[model samples]
Target: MNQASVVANQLIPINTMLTLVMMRSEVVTPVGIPAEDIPRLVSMQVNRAVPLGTTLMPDMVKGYAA
Candidate 1:
């Protein structure tokens, strides 16, 4: 199965489902966050731009206006 990792260098736009599903197909840092908790990351704006093959912490994303 293809694993999903955040897309590298993609500007940190709001965590829309479109961006969420787009960041996938990577094998590194598997289970960085819990499976069910993924949906929690959605729709939350990012505090700063993110990375690839890198683990995204919950603090990285915050409510709107970050």
Candidate 2:
């Protein structure tokens, strides 16, 4: 007579899946905001909020206004 061996299967945990999703879904902080102007930028949030990871770009027009 011959006998057969059985193997067990392992499953991933929900907590680990949720943790990965949380990490992937997390928002990144914005860059290019001057350190000195953080307060003013935050104040602007009261009136309107921008994307979390958005960057402020310089205007690409002509010379600076006099």
Candidate 3:
């Protein structure tokens, strides 16, 4: 006789699911602001809102503004 191994499935808790949903919404929603406005956002959230000299810009990963 062969015995089957039983395993318990670990499901994500409701609280964890809610947190994920909130984070997803935040990322997907439009900020309705300009890319240059990042510093302002950081100022309100980050302790230090120092915009990097070489950071924050569009077309960077592909190319820089000519």
Residue runs of model 3 more than 4 Å from their true location after superposition = 1-31, 45-66
Please give, for residues 1-66, the per-residue lDDT of candidate 3 as tens digits: 222211112222222211111111112122322333333332122122222222222321122222
Top candidate when judged by TM-score against the true structure: 1
Candidate 2: the clashing residue pairs are none
lDDT of 1 by residue, 1-66 (tens): 455534333445444332456344344454343333554556556666565444555556565221
How do the residues 3-48 of candidate 2 rate in per-residue lDDT, one tens digit apiece? 2111111222222211111111112243232333322332121212
- Cα displacement (angstroms), candidate 1, residue 26, comes to 7.9
1 versus 3: better lDDT goes to:
1
lDDT per model, in order? Answer: 0.47, 0.22, 0.23
Clashing pairs in 3: none
Q: Return whichever of 2 and 3 wins on lDDT.
A: 3
Candidate 2 runs further than 4 Å off: 1-31, 45-49, 57-66
For candidate 3, the 10 contiguous residues with the lowest summed lDDT are 17-26
Query: Of the pair 1 and 2, which is ahead by TM-score?
Result: 1
